[PDB]
Each structure stands twice: as structure tokens, then as C-alpha cells.
């Protein structure tokens with residue numbers, strides 16, 4: 001009576017149909033010209049210009065996310081008082097696409113702040129367009145438009161198109177797979193699965209912690225299947241550690257056949273209480289960590305590079321501003337990596353999965369809240385085979401982003417369409 005519902009993001013034309021105490025617009029390394037024109041034209045809105053950070057793209061994202069984050073915190077008393085609109089202007093460009101991830105943060109902010117409207121607006125070349133102010137003004141008039149795209153005289157909104165035997169699989173019986181966050185509860189599950197499927201496989205599990213006894217004990221059974229498993233105890237935030245890990249991979253082994261990026265963690269707190277330190281700490285593994293991995297494994301002939309993202313990244317979730325923006329960055333990265341592959345610069349197919357709560361994933365366990373989330377969302381703790389099935393189905397479809405939900409269909413579809 002429960003079924004996986006399974007979704008896939010779409011840019012659609014969808015323009016079928018109160019007043020703001022405040023109007024804020026944030027520009028992500030937009031053109032100087034753009035900045036000035038907008039301020040002049042929109043002097044009834046505050047305009048913030050993020051151009052300021054130095055780092056790789058991930059570094060700049062983490063920085064700007066913190067700036068958005070500190071902005072909300074401050075305006076917190078206002079949000080109580082009255083309505084507000086923030087619009088983020090993201091130019092589609094070489095890497096600036098990734099800032100579109102700020103959408104995870106905006107969705108969480110909306111859940112936590114009743115009277116906030118937050119829109120992310122991606123623009124192919126905003127400076128060149130000087131019709132811009134009316135659109136922003138016009139977009140401000142349709143609050144329910146959360147993600148909006150302007151390119152080629154086109155105005156798109158993001159929404160969810162549904163996706164619809166025994167499953168094909170990506171496994172090479174010999175050859176190397178790593179799972180960052182591999183000693184975590186999901187990385188072990190996928191470890192076993194590889195073990196069952198693989199035959200003579202090599203599985204490199206990595207994380208920060210020294211292994212506890214039970215982990216090694218849990219690990220040892222997988223050694224039983226005849227797969228060879230090595231725990232490399234590295235921090236994905238540390239670019240050099242990642243480098244070594246990949247090289248040892250290279251020196252040690254023929255090649256890499258596959259990567260799951262499963263490193264990360266959520267730390268629940270409302271934006272009002274959260275520290276900068278905690279905020280950065282949950283961004284790190286999924287944002288910088290992911291970049292670092294991607295760039296160190298660039299020269300490998302991969303069959304796949306799959307990110308383990310979350311339903312939080314695309315819906316937001318109360319108390320997970322940081323987890324959602326981290327996860328949204330990964331989603332945005334999936335498309336960005338594919339483009340690179342078309343350039344021929346990167347090898348293998350890239351997918352980001354928006355996972356729901358797993359039945360026996362560690363991290364969270366549903367318990368009493370399970371019920372609200374079923375009542376709030378119609379979602380249930382997702383069983384492991386259902387998950388593995390969705391995992392295999394997601395690969396064959398070959399989309400950069402797959403959103404997976406398990407629960408009662410009509411409730412789910414009703415909330416999301």
C-alpha cells in the first residue's frame with residue numbers, strides 16, 4: 001500500500017495567474033553595471049552585492065551562504081513584525097551556476113519564517129537585459145514562484161515532473177569503488193550491496209573517525225564475501241588528504257570505477273539559534289569536500305559519480321538551513337559536472353539523489369516525528385530494497401537529479417504535484 005514516488009526537476013513555462021514591509025535583492029558576483037542599474041531602478045529595495053570572497057567556487061559559496069544566513073538572523077525581529085521579500089540573482093555562467101544552490105537555504109528560511117518570500121532567479125546574462133527591474137517587480141508579485149529562470153527571452157519556473165522489470169546495474173565484478181562517508185550507516189548498506197553484487201570487488205570506505213570495534217566487525221563480514229575493503233580515514237574538507245587518498249588509490253590499484261559521495265551530517269537548529277561554526281561545519285563535506293573529491297578524481301575513467309543528497313536540499317526543512325544549502329549545492333554540481341564531461345574534461349555519469357529518510361539509515365530515526373512527517377508529508381521511513389531499487393532506477397534514467405520519496409502517493413503528489 002506504500003510505493004516509491006519518484007520525481008525529476010523541470011524548467012516549465014507556468015505563468016497562469018499582498019504587500020511587503022521590505023524588499024531585498026542579493027546579487028552573486030553579478031556585473032557592476034547590473035548592480036548600479038538595479039539599485040538606481042529599485043531604490044525601494046535594499047541591494048546587496050556579494051563579490052567579495054576569495055577561494056575556489058566552493059569556498060565562495062560557503063562564504064556567501066553564511067552572509068545570507070547572517071542576513072536572515074539579523075532581520076529576524078522584522079520577519080516577526082511584517083512581510084519581506086528576498087530575491088537572489090544568480091547568473092548562469094562558468095561556475096556561478098552553483099550559487100543557485102542558495103535555494104536550499106531560501107526554502108528552509110521560508111519554513112522557519114512565516115512571512116518571508118524568498119526567490120532565486122537565475123539569469124543567463126543579466127547586465128545585457130535592462131528590462132530587469134519589471135521582472136523582479138513582476139516576480140515579486142507571484143510569491144509562489146520559488147525558482148525562476150531567464151535565458152533566451154524565456155521565463156521558466158522550476159517544478160517536478162514525475163518519472164515512470166529487474167534492474168540493470170553499474171557494477172564491474174573487478175574494479176574500484178569508494179564511498180566517502182563510507183563507514184556511516186548508508187555507506188555500509190551500499191558496501192554490502194556492492195559485496196553481494198560484485199564478486200571480486202574493491203571498496204574503499206572513508207571518513208574522519210577511527211573505526212570502532214563493531215564497525216570493523218561489521219566490516220569484516222563484507223571481507224567474507226571476497227570483496228577487498230580498506231578504510232582510509234580521511235577528511236574530505238582537507239584537499240591534501242583527498243589527494244593522498246586518490247593517489248594511494250592510484251598507486252595501490254588500477255583505477256577507480258565509481259564514487260559515492262556520502263560524507264556529511266545534519267545538525268538540527270533553527271536559523272535564529274545556530275552558530276556560524278555549526279553552519280560551516282555542515283556545509284564543509286558536501287560543498288568543499290565534494291569539489292575536492294571531484295577535482296582529485298578528474299583523471300579517472302569512472303562509470304559514475306553519485307552524490308547522496310537529501311529531500312531537504314530541494315524542499316528545505318525546519319532546522320536544516322545549512323544541510324539544505326549543502327545538499328542543494330550538490331544537486332547544482334551534478335549538472336555542472338555533466339557539462340564538464342561534455343567538454344570531455346570529466347569522466348562518467350553524474351547523479352545527485354534527493355533521498356528521503358531511510359528506514360535504517362543512522363543519523364535520524366523517525367519515531368514520533370515519523371508520524372507528523374507522514375501526516376505532514378505522507379512520507380514513510382523508506383525500506384532498504386525500495387531504496388536500492390530507486391538507486392538502480394536512478395542510474396538507468398541518467399538524469400543529474402532524482403528526487404526520491406516513499407510514503408502514500410496521493411498525499412505526496414498532492415503536496416508536490
Ligand SMILES: NC(=O)C1=CN([C@@H]2O[C@H](COP(=O)(O)OP(=O)(O)OC[C@H]3O[C@@H](n4cnc5c(N)ncnc54)[C@H](OP(=O)(O)O)[C@@H]3O)[C@@H](O)[C@H]2O)C=CC1
Nearest residue numbers: 181184185186207208209236262263264308310357358361
Ligand atoms: N540516513 C538517511 O536516511 C538519509 C541520508 N542522506 C544523506 O546520505 C549520506 C549518508 O547518510 P547516513 O550514512 O545516514 O549518515 P551518517 O552520519 O551515518 O553518515 C555520514 C558519514 O559521513 C562521515 N563524515 C562526516 N563528515 C565528514 C568529512 N568532513 N569527511 C569525511 N567523512 C565525513 C561521517 O563519519 P565521521 O564522522 O567518522 O567523519 C559519517 O560516517 C549523508 O550525506 C546524508 O546527508 C540523505 C537523506 C536521508
